[PDB]
Amino acid sequence: XLXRXXX
Amino acid sequence: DIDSLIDKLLNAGFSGKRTKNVCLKNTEIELICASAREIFLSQPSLLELAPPVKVVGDVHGQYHDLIRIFSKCGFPPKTNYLFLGDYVNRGKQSLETILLLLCYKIKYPENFFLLRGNHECANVTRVYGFYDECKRRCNIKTWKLFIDTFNTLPIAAIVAGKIFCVHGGLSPVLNSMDEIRNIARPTDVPDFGLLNDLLWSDPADTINEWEDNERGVSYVFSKVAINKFLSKFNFDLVCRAHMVVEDGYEFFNDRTLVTVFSAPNYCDNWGAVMGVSEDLLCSFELLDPL
Ligand SMILES: [Mn+2]
Ligand SMILES: [Mn+2]
C-alpha cells in the first residue's frame, strides 16, 4: 500500500 | 583501509546512531563505489556459486535490520552471502545499507555477492527516496556514483547448478542462460525486455502463463511458466525476492519457487534469510517485525 511499484 | 570503513559503518549500526551526515566522508563513499564497480565488472553477469551460502531478500534501507541479519546469521566471511537486491529506497538509512554491503563486497569478492534489484536504477531511486537521501545527506555527484555502481551489478546467480536466483522472476524470452551472461555491463534498466523482466516480474496462480503485471510493468508468470523453466534448465528451485510476504518467506507451486523478503515491518511482515547447506538443503532464519 506504499505505492504498486511495492503493502 | 577497507577494514576501518566497515568498523565505522558497523559502529553506527551497533549504536543505532542516527545523523544527517553519513559516518563516511563523500571522498570515502566515492572510493568505495569505484572499487566495487571494478569488482562487479570483473565478475560475470550470471554468477555461479557453490554452497554453503545464505540468501537475503529486500532490505530497502532498513539498516538496523541489516545489522540484525549479520548479528544473527553471521558476519562475513564465515558466512557466504548472496543478496537478491533492493538495497535502497524507502528506508531512512539507504546510504548506510548500501555502503556496508559494498564494503563487504570489496573485502570478500569471492565470498559475498550482490544481485541487482529493480530499485537499483536511476529512475526508481528518483521516485522512491534514495535520490533525495543522497541530495540531502551527500550530494548529487555521490548519487551518480551509486547509479554508476548499480549499472554494473550482476543479474542472476545459479547455486550448485540447481537453484536459480534472481530478484524478480522469469521472462517469456529467457530461452538460454547465456542470454543472462551476455547482458552487457554497465547498463541502465529498460522499460521492457529480458533485463526488465528479471528484475520486475512476479509469480501468481493465474490461468495463463503470461499476463501483464499489476505493478505497471513486466509480467506475472504462472505455475506452468515455472514448471517449463525448471524442466528446460534442469533446476530444482527458483529463489527470488521482490514481493513482500507476511511470514518472511513463502514457497509457491509445490516448493518449486520461494520468495525471500528480508525487510521486516515493510508496510507487519516478518523477515527471513534462506540458508543453503552443502547438500542443497534449504532452511530459514527469521527476523521478527519489532
Ligand atoms: Mn523489487
Ligand atoms: Mn522491493
GROMACS .gro file of C-alpha atoms and ligand atoms in nm:
model
  299
    1UNK     CA    1   0.000   0.000   0.000
    2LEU     CA    2   0.311   0.226  -0.022
    3UNK     CA    3   0.264   0.290  -0.393
    4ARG     CA    4   0.204  -0.082  -0.662
    5UNK     CA    5   0.552  -0.005  -0.800
    6UNK     CA    6   0.553  -0.225  -0.394
    7UNK     CA    7   0.198  -0.302   0.118
    8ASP     CA    8   4.173   0.085   0.472
    9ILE     CA    9   3.852  -0.104   0.397
   10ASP     CA   10   3.858  -0.255   0.747
   11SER     CA   11   3.822   0.087   0.911
   12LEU     CA   12   3.530   0.184   0.686
   13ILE     CA   13   3.349  -0.136   0.786
   14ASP     CA   14   3.420  -0.073   1.155
   15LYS     CA   15   3.288   0.282   1.121
   16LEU     CA   16   2.973   0.164   0.943
   17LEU     CA   17   2.914  -0.115   1.196
   18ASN     CA   18   2.984   0.125   1.484
   19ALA     CA   19   2.694   0.344   1.372
   20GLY     CA   20   2.484   0.030   1.326
   21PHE     CA   21   2.554  -0.127   1.665
   22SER     CA   22   2.476   0.200   1.844
   23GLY     CA   23   2.172   0.297   1.638
   24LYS     CA   24   2.317   0.646   1.596
   25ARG     CA   25   2.100   0.849   1.356
   26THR     CA   26   2.268   1.151   1.196
   27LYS     CA   27   2.208   1.364   0.888
   28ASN     CA   28   2.567   1.321   0.771
   29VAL     CA   29   2.695   0.973   0.690
   30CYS     CA   30   2.973   0.837   0.913
   31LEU     CA   31   3.183   0.813   0.594
   32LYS     CA   32   3.303   1.117   0.402
   33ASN     CA   33   3.193   1.178   0.043
   34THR     CA   34   3.553   1.116  -0.064
   35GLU     CA   35   3.539   0.777   0.110
   36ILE     CA   36   3.200   0.699  -0.046
   37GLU     CA   37   3.349   0.777  -0.388
   38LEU     CA   38   3.637   0.532  -0.342
   39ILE     CA   39   3.400   0.257  -0.224
   40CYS     CA   40   3.179   0.290  -0.533
   41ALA     CA   41   3.489   0.285  -0.754
   42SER     CA   42   3.640  -0.032  -0.607
   43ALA     CA   43   3.309  -0.220  -0.603
   44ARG     CA   44   3.224  -0.120  -0.961
   45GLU     CA   45   3.558  -0.261  -1.078
   46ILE     CA   46   3.499  -0.586  -0.887
   47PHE     CA   47   3.146  -0.621  -1.029
   48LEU     CA   48   3.273  -0.573  -1.386
   49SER     CA   49   3.546  -0.835  -1.334
   50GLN     CA   50   3.278  -1.095  -1.249
   51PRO     CA   51   3.005  -1.232  -1.478
   52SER     CA   52   2.652  -1.101  -1.527
   53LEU     CA   53   2.536  -1.451  -1.425
   54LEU     CA   54   2.708  -1.577  -1.111
   55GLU     CA   55   2.778  -1.945  -1.044
   56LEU     CA   56   2.808  -2.001  -0.669
   57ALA     CA   57   2.881  -2.309  -0.461
   58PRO     CA   58   2.717  -2.386  -0.123
   59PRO     CA   59   2.708  -2.323   0.168
   60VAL     CA   60   2.555  -1.977   0.127
   61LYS     CA   61   2.276  -1.770   0.280
   62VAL     CA   62   2.034  -1.577   0.058
   63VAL     CA   63   1.893  -1.238   0.165
   64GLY     CA   64   1.592  -1.062   0.012
   65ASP     CA   65   1.486  -0.698   0.004
   66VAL     CA   66   1.642  -0.472   0.266
   67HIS     CA   67   1.523  -0.130   0.139
   68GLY     CA   68   1.750   0.088   0.350
   69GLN     CA   69   1.642  -0.070   0.681
   70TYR     CA   70   1.998  -0.059   0.809
   71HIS     CA   71   1.919  -0.169   1.165
   72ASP     CA   72   1.762  -0.484   1.021
   73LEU     CA   73   2.073  -0.545   0.811
   74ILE     CA   74   2.273  -0.537   1.136
   75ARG     CA   75   2.024  -0.783   1.286
   76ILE     CA   76   2.072  -1.011   0.984
   77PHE     CA   77   2.451  -1.017   1.021
   78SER     CA   78   2.436  -1.045   1.401
   79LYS     CA   79   2.201  -1.345   1.384
   80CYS     CA   80   2.304  -1.515   1.059
   81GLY     CA   81   2.677  -1.447   1.098
   82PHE     CA   82   2.912  -1.177   0.977
   83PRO     CA   83   3.125  -1.223   0.663
   84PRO     CA   84   3.334  -1.413   0.571
   85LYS     CA   85   3.246  -1.716   0.785
   86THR     CA   86   2.901  -1.694   0.626
   87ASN     CA   87   2.890  -1.668   0.247
   88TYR     CA   88   2.619  -1.425   0.135
   89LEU     CA   89   2.409  -1.374  -0.176
   90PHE     CA   90   2.180  -1.069  -0.173
   91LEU     CA   91   1.894  -1.057  -0.423
   92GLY     CA   92   1.875  -0.677  -0.449
   93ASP     CA   93   1.656  -0.384  -0.342
   94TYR     CA   94   1.907  -0.230  -0.103
   95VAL     CA   95   1.793   0.133  -0.126
   96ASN     CA   96   1.473   0.346  -0.131
   97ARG     CA   97   1.200   0.369   0.137
   98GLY     CA   98   1.439   0.321   0.429
   99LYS     CA   99   1.583   0.626   0.602
  100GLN     CA  100   1.932   0.470   0.608
  101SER     CA  101   1.972   0.356   0.247
  102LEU     CA  102   2.321   0.509   0.243
  103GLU     CA  103   2.449   0.307   0.539
  104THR     CA  104   2.282  -0.005   0.397
  105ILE     CA  105   2.439   0.007   0.050
  106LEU     CA  106   2.774   0.129   0.185
  107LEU     CA  107   2.814  -0.164   0.425
  108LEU     CA  108   2.722  -0.415   0.154
  109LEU     CA  109   2.967  -0.262  -0.094
  110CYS     CA  110   3.250  -0.262   0.162
  111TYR     CA  111   3.195  -0.633   0.229
  112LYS     CA  112   3.199  -0.691  -0.147
  113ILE     CA  113   3.534  -0.510  -0.171
  114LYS     CA  114   3.682  -0.710   0.117
  115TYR     CA  115   3.544  -1.058   0.029
  116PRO     CA  116   3.498  -1.053  -0.350
  117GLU     CA  117   3.463  -1.433  -0.380
  118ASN     CA  118   3.251  -1.491  -0.067
  119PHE     CA  119   2.999  -1.203  -0.079
  120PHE     CA  120   2.766  -1.138  -0.371
  121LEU     CA  121   2.508  -0.871  -0.456
  122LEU     CA  122   2.247  -0.901  -0.730
  123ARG     CA  123   2.061  -0.610  -0.888
  124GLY     CA  124   1.707  -0.527  -0.785
  125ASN     CA  125   1.455  -0.315  -0.971
  126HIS     CA  126   1.525  -0.032  -0.725
  127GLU     CA  127   1.896  -0.018  -0.817
  128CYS     CA  128   1.850   0.213  -1.114
  129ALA     CA  129   1.840   0.586  -1.180
  130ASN     CA  130   1.468   0.637  -1.241
  131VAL     CA  131   1.338   0.429  -0.949
  132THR     CA  132   1.569   0.596  -0.696
  133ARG     CA  133   1.440   0.936  -0.813
  134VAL     CA  134   1.082   0.839  -0.719
  135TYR     CA  135   1.127   0.626  -0.408
  136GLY     CA  136   1.375   0.810  -0.189
  137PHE     CA  137   1.741   0.727  -0.249
  138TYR     CA  138   1.791   1.023  -0.483
  139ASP     CA  139   1.656   1.261  -0.219
  140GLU     CA  140   1.856   1.087   0.054
  141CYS     CA  141   2.177   1.141  -0.144
  142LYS     CA  142   2.084   1.502  -0.219
  143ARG     CA  143   2.012   1.579   0.147
  144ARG     CA  144   2.285   1.376   0.319
  145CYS     CA  145   2.555   1.391   0.049
  146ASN     CA  146   2.531   1.544  -0.299
  147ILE     CA  147   2.408   1.463  -0.650
  148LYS     CA  148   2.760   1.363  -0.756
  149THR     CA  149   2.753   1.088  -0.492
  150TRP     CA  150   2.413   0.969  -0.617
  151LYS     CA  151   2.552   0.945  -0.971
  152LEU     CA  152   2.846   0.742  -0.840
  153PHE     CA  153   2.597   0.497  -0.688
  154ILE     CA  154   2.399   0.467  -1.012
  155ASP     CA  155   2.725   0.402  -1.199
  156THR     CA  156   2.789   0.122  -0.948
  157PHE     CA  157   2.433  -0.013  -0.971
  158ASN     CA  158   2.462  -0.036  -1.351
  159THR     CA  159   2.738  -0.297  -1.302
  160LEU     CA  160   2.554  -0.525  -1.058
  161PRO     CA  161   2.509  -0.884  -1.182
  162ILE     CA  162   2.162  -1.002  -1.274
  163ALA     CA  163   2.125  -1.363  -1.156
  164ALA     CA  164   2.306  -1.646  -0.981
  165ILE     CA  165   2.297  -2.025  -1.002
  166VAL     CA  166   2.377  -2.213  -0.681
  167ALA     CA  167   2.526  -2.562  -0.733
  168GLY     CA  168   2.371  -2.578  -1.080
  169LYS     CA  169   2.030  -2.637  -0.921
  170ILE     CA  170   1.899  -2.313  -0.761
  171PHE     CA  171   1.829  -2.020  -0.995
  172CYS     CA  172   1.847  -1.692  -0.801
  173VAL     CA  173   1.707  -1.365  -0.939
  174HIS     CA  174   1.541  -1.060  -0.787
  175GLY     CA  175   1.207  -1.059  -0.968
  176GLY     CA  176   1.141  -1.373  -1.168
  177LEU     CA  177   1.105  -1.531  -1.511
  178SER     CA  178   1.054  -1.395  -1.863
  179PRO     CA  179   0.888  -1.512  -2.186
  180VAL     CA  180   1.222  -1.452  -2.363
  181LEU     CA  181   1.450  -1.633  -2.114
  182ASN     CA  182   1.545  -1.901  -2.367
  183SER     CA  183   1.902  -1.970  -2.252
  184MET     CA  184   2.124  -1.887  -1.957
  185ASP     CA  185   2.380  -1.729  -2.192
  186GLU     CA  186   2.127  -1.452  -2.257
  187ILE     CA  187   2.189  -1.356  -1.895
  188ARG     CA  188   2.567  -1.399  -1.923
  189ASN     CA  189   2.573  -1.178  -2.234
  190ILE     CA  190   2.389  -0.887  -2.071
  191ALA     CA  191   2.634  -0.606  -2.140
  192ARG     CA  192   2.753  -0.400  -1.844
  193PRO     CA  193   2.735  -0.126  -1.746
  194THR     CA  194   2.372  -0.078  -1.849
  195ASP     CA  195   2.057   0.101  -1.745
  196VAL     CA  196   1.732  -0.092  -1.694
  197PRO     CA  197   1.498  -0.052  -1.995
  198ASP     CA  198   1.120  -0.031  -1.969
  199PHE     CA  199   1.098  -0.372  -2.139
  200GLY     CA  200   1.296  -0.681  -2.230
  201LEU     CA  201   1.465  -0.970  -2.056
  202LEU     CA  202   1.655  -0.748  -1.811
  203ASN     CA  203   1.339  -0.562  -1.710
  204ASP     CA  204   1.151  -0.890  -1.663
  205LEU     CA  205   1.422  -1.049  -1.447
  206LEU     CA  206   1.402  -0.756  -1.204
  207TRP     CA  207   1.027  -0.685  -1.210
  208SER     CA  208   0.816  -0.999  -1.264
  209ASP     CA  209   0.613  -1.186  -1.002
  210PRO     CA  210   0.464  -1.535  -0.971
  211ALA     CA  211   0.092  -1.598  -0.942
  212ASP     CA  212  -0.169  -1.873  -0.958
  213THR     CA  213  -0.306  -1.739  -1.286
  214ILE     CA  214  -0.489  -1.926  -1.561
  215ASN     CA  215  -0.241  -1.807  -1.826
  216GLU     CA  216   0.136  -1.844  -1.845
  217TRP     CA  217   0.194  -1.471  -1.904
  218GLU     CA  218  -0.020  -1.173  -1.802
  219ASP     CA  219   0.063  -0.806  -1.756
  220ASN     CA  220   0.183  -0.724  -1.404
  221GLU     CA  221  -0.033  -0.504  -1.182
  222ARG     CA  222   0.280  -0.312  -1.078
  223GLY     CA  223   0.253  -0.139  -1.418
  224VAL     CA  224   0.546  -0.308  -1.594
  225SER     CA  225   0.671  -0.657  -1.691
  226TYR     CA  226   0.465  -0.972  -1.628
  227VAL     CA  227   0.317  -1.213  -1.378
  228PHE     CA  228   0.404  -1.575  -1.456
  229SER     CA  229   0.201  -1.883  -1.367
  230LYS     CA  230   0.287  -2.226  -1.228
  231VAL     CA  231   0.316  -2.350  -1.588
  232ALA     CA  232   0.592  -2.097  -1.655
  233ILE     CA  233   0.786  -2.221  -1.351
  234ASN     CA  234   0.747  -2.588  -1.445
  235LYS     CA  235   0.862  -2.530  -1.804
  236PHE     CA  236   1.156  -2.319  -1.682
  237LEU     CA  237   1.278  -2.570  -1.423
  238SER     CA  238   1.241  -2.858  -1.668
  239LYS     CA  239   1.422  -2.681  -1.953
  240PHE     CA  240   1.728  -2.578  -1.750
  241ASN     CA  241   1.727  -2.871  -1.503
  242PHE     CA  242   1.685  -2.656  -1.192
  243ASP     CA  243   1.513  -2.764  -0.871
  244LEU     CA  244   1.417  -2.424  -0.729
  245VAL     CA  245   1.362  -2.061  -0.823
  246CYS     CA  246   1.475  -1.835  -0.537
  247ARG     CA  247   1.361  -1.474  -0.568
  248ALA     CA  248   1.256  -1.170  -0.367
  249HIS     CA  249   1.080  -0.853  -0.489
  250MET     CA  250   0.745  -0.935  -0.324
  251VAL     CA  251   0.665  -0.866   0.041
  252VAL     CA  252   0.539  -1.179   0.217
  253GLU     CA  253   0.384  -1.192   0.563
  254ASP     CA  254   0.593  -1.478   0.706
  255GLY     CA  255   0.928  -1.353   0.573
  256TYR     CA  256   0.943  -1.632   0.315
  257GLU     CA  257   0.681  -1.820   0.117
  258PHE     CA  258   0.711  -2.127  -0.104
  259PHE     CA  259   0.494  -2.148  -0.415
  260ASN     CA  260   0.392  -2.420  -0.663
  261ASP     CA  261   0.483  -2.733  -0.464
  262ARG     CA  262   0.801  -2.568  -0.332
  263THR     CA  263   0.939  -2.509  -0.683
  264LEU     CA  264   0.974  -2.136  -0.608
  265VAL     CA  265   1.039  -1.938  -0.290
  266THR     CA  266   1.016  -1.566  -0.219
  267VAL     CA  267   1.264  -1.439   0.041
  268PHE     CA  268   1.185  -1.095   0.184
  269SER     CA  269   1.424  -0.954   0.443
  270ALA     CA  270   1.272  -0.614   0.533
  271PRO     CA  271   1.060  -0.664   0.848
  272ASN     CA  272   0.758  -0.440   0.904
  273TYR     CA  273   0.780  -0.308   0.549
  274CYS     CA  274   0.425  -0.171   0.525
  275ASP     CA  275   0.375  -0.611   0.975
  276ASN     CA  276   0.568  -0.879   0.791
  277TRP     CA  277   0.846  -1.099   0.922
  278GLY     CA  278   1.189  -1.103   0.761
  279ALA     CA  279   1.366  -1.420   0.653
  280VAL     CA  280   1.706  -1.539   0.533
  281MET     CA  281   1.749  -1.868   0.346
  282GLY     CA  282   2.043  -2.097   0.417
  283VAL     CA  283   2.164  -2.349   0.158
  284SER     CA  284   2.371  -2.634   0.300
  285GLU     CA  285   2.645  -2.819   0.114
  286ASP     CA  286   2.387  -3.088   0.030
  287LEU     CA  287   2.148  -2.823  -0.110
  288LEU     CA  288   1.915  -2.833   0.191
  289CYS     CA  289   1.717  -2.510   0.233
  290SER     CA  290   1.646  -2.377   0.583
  291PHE     CA  291   1.547  -2.033   0.709
  292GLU     CA  292   1.621  -1.787   0.988
  293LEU     CA  293   1.354  -1.538   1.094
  294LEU     CA  294   1.356  -1.167   1.180
  295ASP     CA  295   1.063  -1.050   1.391
  296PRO     CA  296   0.883  -0.729   1.284
  297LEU     CA  297   0.964  -0.533   1.601
  298MN      MN  298   1.188  -0.534  -0.611
  299MN      MN  299   1.148  -0.446  -0.312
   0.00000   0.00000   0.00000
